[PDB]
Amino acid sequence: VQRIYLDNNATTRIDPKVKEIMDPFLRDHYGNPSSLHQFGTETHPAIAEALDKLYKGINARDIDDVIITSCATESNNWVLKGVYFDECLKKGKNHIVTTVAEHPAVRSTCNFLESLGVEVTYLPINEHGSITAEQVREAITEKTALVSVMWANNETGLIFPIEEIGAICKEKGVLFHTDAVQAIGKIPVDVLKANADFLSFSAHKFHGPKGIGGLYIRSGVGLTPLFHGGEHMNGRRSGTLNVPYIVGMGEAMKLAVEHLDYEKEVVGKLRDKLEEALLKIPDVMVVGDRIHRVPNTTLVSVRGIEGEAMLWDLNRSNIAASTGSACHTAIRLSLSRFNTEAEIDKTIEVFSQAAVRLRNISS
Amino acid sequence: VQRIYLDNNATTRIDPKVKEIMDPFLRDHYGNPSSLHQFGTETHPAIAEALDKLYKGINARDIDDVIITSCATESNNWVLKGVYFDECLKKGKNHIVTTVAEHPAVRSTCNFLESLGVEVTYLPINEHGSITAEQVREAITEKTALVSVMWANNETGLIFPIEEIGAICKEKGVLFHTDAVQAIGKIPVDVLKANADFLSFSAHKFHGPKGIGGLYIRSGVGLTPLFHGGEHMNGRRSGTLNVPYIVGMGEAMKLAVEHLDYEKEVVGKLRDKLEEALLKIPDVMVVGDRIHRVPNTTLVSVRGIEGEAMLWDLNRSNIAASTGSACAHTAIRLSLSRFNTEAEIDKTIEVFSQAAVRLRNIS
Ligand SMILES: N[C@@H](CCS)C(=O)O
Ligand SMILES: N[C@@H](CCS)C(=O)O
What are the binding positions for pyridoxal 5'-phosphate in this chain (chain A)? Predict the structure, then answer.
């Protein structure tokens, strides 16, 4: 059989070179990087090279931190709860601005903080499926400890006004976090252009393994640890380093940024071919803006067929995609550098056949 | 060259069967287990088999939880901070009983909690290198939210009472956590015999990969999540599952308990050989009780050469060991595994003895 993977915003396939670079640390180089002996120090070059690729990938400076976490969910929790303790409690800045589109690792955590008494503003989405930077300016009070806005939305692919949001936060003296998991390898990410204080990412959205991520922390910015303990990561996040996955995530970041052109010029054109072909189908329409999106994502709605019905039919033909709320659920088809034009043609065909058969059965 | 690995309490080599069982999830079975399509559901049977091995490894019941964490440090932070919120803050039980012997993942987190006002009693170690169950008895007030005592000490290998301590906690209505990281695969671990509410472990001390751990939570016990979000792990710990390491850690756990007889009978005999041989050296003495220890660990002190000097010399000969606090200054912790051999121990006796006599003549 030959299956087609079009659910890359949910997770991605590890790049074969990433598997390759990880293998020696799953085998004979198993020493603890914190060890003073040869098994420990022999890992230091590869870890340093992995860190360098991570820093350069997002334009972090030598004075900034790029802290290894176990996933973007950890990074997001660490930002929100660290700021809750540092600014909301200790400084009386008991207000946070975020959006209604945020990933559950941000929204669900904010719901918890609200239960502790934090005031949380969930900025509403516009008809374009996006947030305006004016919205964050409206919502910032003199009590706002932190603004958290995702760089790109995981369901629609829509890119948010990070640069502007960062300028507004800087002129107002407010800490800025961006959950940038969906942007890595899709668009260039520059923490300096964003004026971000915090930036989250997760390797498995860009062809590294599940269960590692990163938190960028700007120089001089504090954040009470979420993992207290040993002295790992300049004392900011304790726990024995996940050597293999650090090395892999570094390589995944490098390869991601090296393929940025290809992602926009080849993968984006496969996304357009897919979307344009699917819009010749009657009742089919894109949910949200078709401009200011990452190259790999299309979220289409089909007049009477639910998203899950299309997903179940599509899965029977070994094509993997997922749902995305529409505002009844829509179909998110999300591509990568590993898809081919043959697969898009095939998906056009199977998607169309499924559409016509599910309508005929619908009445 | 032939290096000799004797620092297994710091981390271990991944068993080749563990690496083998992980590889397919690093290659073609890269689906997100939360996905409804085929790429996600195809991972379910391996995850269920992995979980089963973990439960059986610690005699957790079907009604209990074994939550997948990113390491023991997460498990410990999660226990201590979740109990701070649920009992110290929400119930006014503003007191915690632990030991001076704990891993920093416990003590340093407790020090943070002391900064928040929690009363923490760090039970002092006795001349035997252990704590008694009577000490926890004496220290329990009606304000005690939690007792946390590690099952086995990572520096001395000394086994703590646990069974009796858990009986005392249950009769007094106090939550009991044991950091059991050093016990897995070293001695049988039975959470029901321990009457543990919480039990922590980390795969890389039992020949699984770094960066994955577990937290046993007894059925019905609550613990406010450390990671809020997507509602993975029955809503208790959010973030995309690290499928390869879960499958690997399950197999590592299975292998550890299947090798318990070998650990006690062969590895234990090798540790005794090493230790007895090193006690023929003058001025040498094991730090602590030499009874009620895990089989694999010996902690030796040498008159006036500190541990670091012996480690540097030993490392030059490609033998890896680590230090340990002794109350000349520091001692040498030698921790074996099922992958060490009698040839290695002989070579190590030779090299250690030569190192001692040479460093003494220079001293
Ligand atoms: N639900 C997310 C992945 C994190 S669970 C998405 O598929 O876009
Ligand atoms: N507990 C470790 C130190 C880093 S986790 C050890 O004893 O070698």
Answer: 72-73, 154, 182, 202-204, 240
Residues B9 and B148 placed together within one structural domain of the fold: no
Is A363 a member of any domain? no
**For residue B260, what are the CA distances in angstroms to B183, B266, B280, B297?**
11, 10, 29, 15
Same domain, A267 and A315: yes
Residue in A12, A71, A181 to test binding to B, most B beta-carbons within 10 Å: A71
Residue A360 placed within a domain: no
B213 and B90 in a single domain? The answer is yes
Distance of CA A353 to the CA centre of its chain: 32
Residues A21 and A154 in one domain: yes
Our answer on whether the CB atom of B154 is closer than 6 Å to any ligand 2 atom is yes
Asked if the C-beta of B115 comes within 8 angstroms of chain A's C-beta atoms, the answer is no
Q: Taking the CA atoms of chain B, what radius of gyration do you get in angstroms? A: 21
In a domain, B127, yes or no: yes
CA–centroid distance, residue B313 to ligand 1 (Å): 51
Q: Given in angstroms, what resolution was this structure solved at?
A: 1.9
What CATH number corresponds to the domain at position A231?
3.40.640.10
User: A188: burial class by Cβ within 10 Å (0-12, 13-18, 19+)?
Assistant: middle
Burial of A304 (0-12, 13-18, 19+ CB in 10 A): exposed
| Chain A residues whose beta carbon lies within 8 Å of the beta carbon of residue B340 | none
- What does A320-343 look like in DSSP terms, one character per residue? E-EEEE---EEEEEE--TT--HHH
Dihedral sign from CA coordinates of A290, A294, A297, A301: negative
Contact A116, A89 (CB under 8 A): no
